[PDB]
Paper text:
During biosynthesis by multi-modular trans-AT polyketide synthases, polyketide structural space can be expanded by conversion of initially-formed electrophilic β-ketones into β-alkyl groups. These multi-step transformations are catalysed by 3-hydroxy-3-methylgluratryl synthase cassettes of enzymes. In this work, we investigated the β-methylation module 5 present in the virginiamycin (Vir) trans-AT PKS-NRPS, which comprises a KS domain and tandem ACPs (ACP5a and ACP5b). We show here that β-methylation cassette members VirC, VirD and VirE do indeed preferentially recognise ACP5b, even when the ACP is excised from its modular context, and that β-modification occurs within defined ACP5b/partner complexes.
Instead, the crystal structure of the holo-ACP5b–VirD complex identifies an ACP interaction motif centred on the phosphopantetheine (Ppant) prosthetic arm and surrounding secondary structural elements, with specificity conferred via distinctive electrostatic surface features of the domain combined with precise Ppant positioning. As evidenced by the H3 crystal symmetry, VirD forms characteristic homotrimeric disks, two of which are stacked, with six ACPs distributed equatorially at the interface between the trimers. In this arrangement, the smallest gap between S6871 of ACP5b bearing the Ppant (∼20 Å) and the catalytic E128 of a VirD monomer is ca. 13.9 Å, with the other VirD active sites more than 33.8 Å distant. VirD elements contributing to the interface include the β-strand β10 and the subsequent loop (β10–α4) of one monomer, and the β-turn (β1–β2), the loop (α1–β4) and helix α7 of a second monomer. Notably, the interface also incorporates the well-folded helix α10 of the first monomer, which is disordered in the structure of VirD alone. Concerning the ACP, the interaction involves the C-terminal portion of helix α1, the adjacent loop (α1–α2) and the N-terminal regions of helices α2 and α3. The structure of the complex also identifies key interactions between VirD and the Ppant tethered to S6871 of ACP5b (the distal end of which is not visible in the electron density), consistent with its contribution to binding affinity as observed by fluorescence quenching. Specifically, R125 of VirD, whose side chain is oriented by a water molecule, forms a salt bridge with the Ppant phosphate. The same water molecule bridges R192 from an adjacent VirD monomer, which participates in a salt bridge with D6870 of ACP5b. Gratifyingly, close inspection of the holo-ACP5b–VirD complex structure identified ACP5b N6865 located in the α1–α2 loop as a potential specificity determinant.
Numbering used by the authors:
A (entry chain C), E (entry chain D), F (entry chain C), G (entry chain D), K (entry chain D), L (entry chain C): 6835 to 6912
B (entry chain B), C (entry chain B), D (entry chain B): -1 to 63, 72 to 229, 231 to 243
H (entry chain A), I (entry chain A), J (entry chain A): -2 to 63, 70 to 228, 231 to 243
Write the structure that this text describes.
C-alpha cells in the first residue's frame, strides 16, 4: 500500500513548494508543480534519509509525480 | 483504467489517468470519455464538462505500443465536445501529441499551462491527421493548421495562445479553471446549448466529413507505415 | 432624436446622438441609420458612409429602459453596411456593448480610440447574439468570436486591434479618420462596390441566415429573461 | 527569358529571372512556371517545388509596359501551387506587388526576408484582385485580405509573418529554405499529396470561382483604367 | 458580532468563485478575488435573502472586502 | 439657451487642452478629449468662479461632455 | 511672390488630406503630412493644370514641402 | 490593533499593511510598525525572507492627507526603504492594489516586486508641487533614470503588465499573492548568508552616496512647507 | 532671417529649426540662436515649457559637412545640451524627420522626446572615424550604456517605434506634433518651480562630473583633426 | 592540443573554446590561453576584431567542479573580462550553447553578444552559496542593476530571445555564427583607432572604480572557502 | 583514424540538412546544426549500415557533434 | 562577355561581406546581400580603381545586383 509514503512525501513537497498538502495533485508532474532540479535533489535526499534509501536524483525523471514516486518508494522500502 | 470521473458544483471532470503509458488514445479511452460525457449530459444540473490529465502527457495520441457513412469513435467524440449542451473545457499541463491535439482543440475552451505542448506528428509517420484538423483549423485558421501539420510544428502555451489553439495560458492550466467556472456560472446550460448549436449553424462541417476524415486516416495507416511508426518510436 | 447626419467631401456621416441614453438600439435608430445610408447611396458623388457617436457609449445595444423569410431590421442594416457600394467606416471612441458591437463590426473599417470598448453581454442575459456574431466572426475568426461570447470578453482598442475587430487603433478614433478618407480618395465607388460584391461572392452568408439569426434572438428574448435583464440592469 | 530552372536533391527550383523588368507577370512567365511545375511533377523522386526570384522585385504583377467555364492561366497556376503533390515554397527577398502577392500566397509555405514587401495595388488602378484574393484570404483571413485590398496596405517581412501571409521571416528568405527542405525530407510526396488534397476537401473553392474571378478582373481592366494605370506608372 | 456573518459570506463567495472558503482572504478586495459586477449582484441578493435586508448592488463598492461587508451587514442585523 | 455657456466653456477647455475652440466636438466625452481628473477639477473650478456656482468635481462624471455640461450650467446659472 | 501660390496649393492639399488649410504647416515634409505617391501624382497634375506647367511627379521629391514647392512653382510662373 | 499585522511562516515573516478603510497610508506608526516587524524578522536567525503585503484596493496610498530635520538626519521613510535594500533577508513586495506616491517607493525598495491584476503604481507628487525625492532612487534603480524621471514629470500610472515591462515589477500575474509560493520555494535553494552578501555587493557596485538620504529628506520637507491648495485639488480629484 | 524661428504660446516658447533646404545642420548660428531662444523663454517668469521642433525631412542633420579649446572650456554644443537638462522649463523635442549625428544629442538632451512616423535617429560618427562624445551622455541617460555604445559602434538607426522601445523617445505616434497638445496639457497640472526642482534632483541623483563636458569636447576635436576622406565617403553615401 | 584553438581571418583573430567533452570550463589554462590569444590579436596592427566562439552544447560552463589574493591583486578571470571591455579590438561573443556561471561574464564582457537558438545564460552561483561578484559588473552594464541582481537571486535562465530582450545579447537568430558575417562587414566601415577611442570613452563615462576587481575577487574567494555540499548538490542536479 | 569516418558522416549530414559539407563545423552540436530526433534516427541507421554497427538512436545524445560521433564510431570500427 | 568582371567583383564583395565568393547569388539585390550605403561607396571605389572608371556611388541603385553591375562595367571597360 503506497498511501503512508504518499502522505509523508506530500507533506515534505508542500513545505518545499510553500503550499498545503491538500493543494497537491498526486498525479501532477513535478514540472507542473514547479519542483526545479535543485529542490528535486533535496526532495530525493529527503526520501533517502527517511526510508534508508539512496535513489539517484534521476528517479524523479523515471517516476515524475507524487503517486508514481510513492509506488516506487513503497515497493522499495520495508 | 484510462479515465477517472470527479463531480463538482455544476460540473463533471473526466481525468485521463494512465500517465505511465502517456495517456494514449485507444477504444477504452474513447468509450470511457463518451460515457463520462453521457453521465454529465444526463445530470440536468450539470453545465460544464472538464477534460484534464495526469503526469507529463496530456494525451500522446493513438497507442503505438468502416461501414459506409460510419465514423471512427474519435471523430464522434470530438464532434460531441463541439455539440454538447455542456461548456467543454480542456486543461493542458503536459504534451498533447497527434490525436491528443484534436481532443483538446474540440473543447469550447483550452487552458494551457507552462508544460503544455501541442504537436501534430502525423506527417512524420506518413499520415494525415484528417480527423483532428477540422477541430484545430476552427481555432487557428486553415493556413496555420495545415502548415503546422506539414512542418509538425510544436506549440508551447504562449505560441498555442497566440495562434488561437489555447484561449488562455498561464503557469498552470488547472489554476486558470476556477475563474472560467466562476464566469460560466453567470450563464446557464440552455444559453450555452443554443450558442454551440448556432456555431454549428454558422461554421458547419458537411455530413460526409466524418466518414471521409476517418477513411483517409484508415487508408494511410493501412499503407510503409509500420517502419515510419518504428522510426517515430525510436526517436521517442 | 437618435441620428444626426453631416455631409462632407465625398462622404455622409451618421452620428448616434443620444449620449444621455447611451445610444441604444431601437426601431428609431435602425430606421434613421437605414435612411442616412439611403441618402448617402442616392448621392452618386458619395463614396464613404461614416458611423460615429457621442459621449461615453458608441452604442449600448437594445434599449432595456417575424413572418417567414423576414429578417429583423438590425440584420437588414448590418448586411447593408457589408453590401453598400460606399466604404463603411465605424469611429469607436466609447463603449460598444451587445448589438452595438455588431453595428461597428459590420462596417468595412473599424477605427478604435483609447476609450473604445467592445463586449457581447448577451449570454449574461440568457441570449445568443446570433445577428451580431457573423459580422464579428468575419473579423475575429469563429473561435475568438464564440469564446468572447461565452466569456462575455471585453476588448479595449489594442485587444480589438490584435484580434481583427478593429482595423486601426490610436488615442482617438476620430483622428484616424482623415488618413483613411485621404487613402479612399485614391480609389472610387465603382471599385469599392465591386470589391465588397466579391467579398460576398468569396465569404457568403446563406440566404436563410438572417431569418434564422433573427428567430434565435426572438426565441431567447421571449423566454427567465426579464430577471437576467433586471440583474444586468442592477449591475450597470 | 523569364524563368530559369535549377534541380536539387528531391526538388525543382523555378527562378523568376527578369530583374531589370521587375519580374512581371505575362503569358511567357505563367507558361514557363506551368512547364517547370510539369517537369517537377513528372520526376517521381521530386517532392518540393521552390519559387524564388532575382533583384529587388519578387514579382511586380501584370506587365504594364474568356470562353464560358474557362479560367485565365494565372488562376490555373495559383490553383496548381495549392493542389500539386509537391510541397510549394515561395522565397520572397524583394517586392511582391499586385498579382505577385497571389503567386507567393498560393505556395504551401512563404519565406520572407528583410527586403520582402507585399502590396495589392489593384484598387488604386480601379481593379479588384479577384484571382489573387482567395490565395491571400486562406492565409490572412477574409477581414485582413479585403481591408489590405481597400487600403492597398504594404506588409514588410514581420507584418506579413504576423498576419499569416508569410509562414517564416528572417534576414534572408533564401537562408530559411535549407531547414524547411531538411524538415520536408522527414515526410514524403504521397503524404504531402494527401494533406493538400484534404485541405481542398476541408477549405474548398467552388468550381465557378476561377471563371468568376477571371471575369471580374477582365471586366474592370476593359473599363477609366488606362488613366489609373498611367497614374500608377508615374507614381512608380 | 461580525465573525459569523463573515463565515456565511465566505462560504457563499467560495461557492461563487469555485474555491474553498479557507482559500479566501477576508481583507482582499472583491476585484482581487475575481468577483465581477454580475456575481456581485447575485452575492448582494444572497446577503439580502439570508439577512432580510434590501441592500443596493452598489454596497460591494462601499465595503469592497468580505471583512468590510460583514461588519456593515452585522451592524444592520438584529 | 445653453449656447453662450458652451462658448465660454469651449474656450476654457481649448486653453486647458492646448487646442483651438474650433477643434472640440461638444458631444465628445471628457475622457475622449483627454481631460484628466486633475484638469477636471480646475475646469469645474472655472465653471464655479465664472457662474457663481459650487458644483462638485464629480459633475463631469454626471454630464461627461461640453454639451451636457453646458445644459447643466445653463439651467443652473442666472 | 510665392505666398498666393502657397495658399492655392495649401487649399488643394487640405482637400486631398481631409483637413482644413489652417491645419497644414507649410514647412512640414509631404511624408509627415501623409501624402502618398498616388495623391502626389494627382497634386502635381493639379499644379500643372492651375499654372500651365509640365512638371514630373518627381518634383515633390526635389521640393518636399508646401513652402519649397510654392517657391519653385512661383519662380516658373509668369 | 495596529497598522501592521505580523504573520510567521517557514523561514519568513509577513508584514501586512492592515488599515484598508484608510487606504494603508504612510504615517509615523506605519513606519515604526514596519521597522519593528523587520527587527523581529532579522532577530530570528532562521528567518530568510521578509514579505510585505497589504489589504483592500490600496497596497499603500502614501502620506495621509485625510517635521524638523537635524544635520545628517534622514526621515524614517528613507531609513525604512534603505533597510529593505540592505536587510540580510530577501524583501518581497506583494502588490494587488494601488501603490500611490510614497507607496511606490515602499514596493520598489523590496528585492522582488510581485504585481497582480489590480496593481497600479503612480507618483502623483508633481501634481502637488512635490518632488518624490525619497522614493526616486528606489524606483530609478529598477526603471533606469529616464523612465523614473519622465514617469514623475507626467505622473504616469503603471498597471501590472506596464510595471513588469519597465522593471518596477519583477513578476506579474492575475494575483500577486499567487506568485509568492514559487518565489519562496526558489529562495529556499539559497540561504540568508548568500542573500546578505548579494545585497551588500549591490550597494558596493551601485552605491547611494551618504548625503543622499538627508538631501532627499530636505527636498521633500522644503516643497511640502501653495502646497495646501494643490493637495486639496488632489483630494477633490480623488 | 535666422536658423531658429521663435513662437510664443500659453506658458511656452517654441524654437523651430528653420533651415530645411540645408537639412537643419548644427553650426555656430544654430547653437547661439537656440541658446538665445532658451534665454528669452527662461527670462519670461510665466514660461514653463521650451518646445524644440523642426522643418522638412531633417529634424537636425548634425554638424554641416556641405576649433581651439581652453582649459575647463566646453564646446557650445555641450553647453546647449546641458542647458536643456538643467533649464527650469520642461524641454520637449518634436521629431518628425531625420535626427543624424549631433541631431540625436539635441533631441535626447530634452526632458521629453516625441517621435512621429518619419522620425529616424542615427549616430553616424564611427563611420567618419569620430566618437560622438558630446551626445553620448544624453543618449546613454535614456537608452542605458550598452544600447548607446552598441548603437554607436554599429551606427544603428532607430525609427519612432524602435526609438520608443529603447527609451530614446518617450512617446511615439503618426506625428510628433500631434503628441504635443496632450504633453502640454499634462505639464499644465504642475508648475516651473516643481519642474525646476525635479531636473535639479535628476542632476543630484545621476550627475555628470564637472570635467566631462571638456573631455568630451576634446575627444571630438582630436578625432576631427584621414577624417577628410571618411567625411567625403559619408557625403557620397548621402 | 590546448583549451583555445586560434584562427586568423581578414582583420580578425578568432579564439575558439575547444574542450566540448569537458563543457568548456574556466580553469587557469583557459584564462591564460585566452589572454595569450588577445595578446597575439592586439600585437597585429591590422587586426580590428577579436571573435570569441565555442564548441558543442556548452559555450562555457564556468569554473570546473569535475587561491591566495595579494593586496590590489585581481583574479585572472577579472583581468580577462576587463581586457575584453578595454581592448582596442571589437570583442564579439558567438553563443550557440549554455553559458553558465562564469561563462555568462565571459560572453557579457564582449562589446557585442550574438545568441543562437541553443544559447542559454544562467548565473547558478547563489544555488552554491556564492555571489558572482566578478561577472556581475559585466552583466549589469548590459541588463541594468535590477535585472542583473534579480536574475542572480533567482538563478534566472535566459534563452536567445530573453537574453536579447534584457540587453545581455545584442543580436539573436537561429545561429550565432550566422549573425557574425554582417557584424564583421559593419565593423569594416570603421577602424581600430575609432573602436579603441570609443571603448576608452565608455570607461570614462561609465567607470568601474580601481578597487572593484580586488573586492569582487575577494568576495568570490571568501564564499568558495558548506560550499562543498552545495556544489555536490549542483553537480547531482547536473 | 577518425578523419575518414568524420568525412563520410559530414557528407551524409550535409545531404540531410540541404547544405554543403564545407558549411558544417565538426564541433557544432547536432542541435545547433538543426538535426531533429527524426533525421537523427535516419542518421544513426546510416552510421549502422555504413559501419555494420547496431547503435541506439541515443548515441547522438552521448556524442552530440560530428567530431565526437566520428571518434566513437572509428573506435568501434575494425 | 561579363564573366571575368563578375569574378573580380564577386571576390571583392565576398571579402567586404565576410563570405566566400561561392556563397553569393549574382542576381541577389545588394540590399538582400547586406551591402549598406557605406560599403557600397567602397565597392564602387573598388570598381573605379580596378577598371580606370569613375562611376557615381549611385550606380549600385541603377544596377542593383552583381550580374547587372558586371554587364554595366563589362560594356564600359576595355
Ligand atoms: P535545475 O532546475 O537547476 O536544472 C538543471 C538542469 C541540468 C536540469 C537543466 O538546467 C538543463 O540544462 N536541462 C533541462 C532539461 C532536463 O531536465 N534535463 C534533461 C535530462 S533527460
Ligand atoms: P460587470 O463586471 O459585467 O460590469 C461592470 C462595469 C462594466 C460597469 C465595469 O467594467 C466598469 O465600467 N467599471 C468602471 C471601473 C474601473 O475603474 N475600471 C477598472 C480599471 S481601474
Ligand atoms: P486623475 O486623472 O489623476 O485620476 C484620479 C482618479 C481617482 C480618477 C483615478 O486615478 C482612479 O483611481 N480611478 C479611475 C476611474 C475613475 O474615474 N474613478 C471612478 C469613479 S466613478
Ligand atoms: P506610393 O506611395 O503608392 O508608392 C511609392 C513607393 C512604393 C515607390 C515607395 O514606397 C518607395 O519605394 N519608396 C522608397 C522610399 C523610402 O526610402 N522609404 C521610406 C522609409 S525611410
Ligand atoms: P524529435 O525532434 O521529433 O523529438 C524529440 C523530443 C520531442 C523527444 C524532444 O523535443 C524532447 O522532448 N526533448 C527534451 C529536450 C530538451 O531539453 N529540450 C530542449 C530545450 S533546452
Ligand atoms: P547607408 O547605409 O549609411 O545609408 C545612407 C542613406 C542615405 C542611403 C540612408 O540612410 C537614407 O537615408 N535613405 C535610405 C533609402 C535610400 O537608399 N535612399 C534613397 C535614394 S533613391
Ligand atoms: Cl486524425
Ligand atoms: Cl444579435
Ligand atoms: Cl487578381
Ligand atoms: Cl518621496
Ligand atoms: Cl558628439
Ligand atoms: Cl564571478
Ligand atoms: Na503569472
Ligand atoms: Na500615438
Ligand atoms: Na536573425
Amino acid at each position: 500500500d503506497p498511501a503512508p509514503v504518499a502522505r509523508a512525501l506530500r507533506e515534505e513537497l508542500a513545505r518545499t513548494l510553500y503550499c498545503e498538502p491538500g493543494d497537491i495533485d498526486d498525479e501532477a508532474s513535478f514540472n507542473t508543480l514547479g519542483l526545479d532540479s535543485i529542490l528535486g535533489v533535496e526532495f530525493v535526499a529527503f526520501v533517502n534519509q527517511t526510508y534508508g534509501l539512496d535513489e539517484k536524483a534521476g528517479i524523479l525523471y523515471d517516476h515524475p509525480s507524487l503517486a508514481a514516486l510513492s509506488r516506487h518508494v513503497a515497493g522499495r522500502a520495508a | 483504467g484510462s479515465v477517472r470521473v470527479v463531480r463538482g458544483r455544476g460540473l463533471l471532470r473526466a481525468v485521463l489517468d494512465r500517465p505511465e503509458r502517456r495517456n494514449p488514445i485507444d477504444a477504452g479511452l474513447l468509450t470511457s470519455l463518451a460515457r463520462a460525457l453521457d453521465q454529465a449530459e444526463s445530470d440536468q444540473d450539470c453545465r460544464v464538462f472538464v477534460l484534464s490529465s495526469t503526469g507529463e502527457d496530456f494525451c500522446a495520441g493513438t497507442d503505438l505500443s468502416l461501414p459506409d457513412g460510419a465514423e471512427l469513435p474519435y471523430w464522434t467524440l470530438l464532434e460531441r465536445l463541439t455539440r454538447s449542451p455542456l461548456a467543454t473545457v480542456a486543461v493542458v499541463d503536459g504534451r498533447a501529441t497527434a490525436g491528443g491535439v484534436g481532443l483538446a482543440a474540440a473543447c469550447d475552451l483550452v487552458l494551457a499551462g507552462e508544460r503544455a505542448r501541442f504537436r501534430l506528428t502525423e506527417v512524420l509517420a506518413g499520415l494525415v491527421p484528417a480527423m483532428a484538423l477540422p477541430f484545430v483549423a476552427r481555432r487557428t485558421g486553415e493556413q496555420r493548421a495545415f502548415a503546422a501539420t506539414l512542418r509538425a510544428e510544436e506549440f508551447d502555451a504562449g505560441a498555442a495562445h497566440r495562434v488561437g489553439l489555447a484561449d488562455l495560458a498561464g503557469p498552470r492550466a488547472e489554476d486558470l479553471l476556477p475563474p472560467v467556472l466562476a464566469g460560466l456560472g453567470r450563464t446557464d446550460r440552455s444559453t450555452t446549448a443554443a450558442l454551440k448549436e448556432y456555431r454549428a449553424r454558422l461554421f458547419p462541417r458537411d455530413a460526409r466529413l466524418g466518414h471521409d476524415a476517418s477513411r483517409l486516416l484508415i487508408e494511410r495507416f493501412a499503407a510503409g507505415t509500420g517502419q515510419l511508426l518504428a522510426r517515430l518510436r525510436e526517436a521517442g
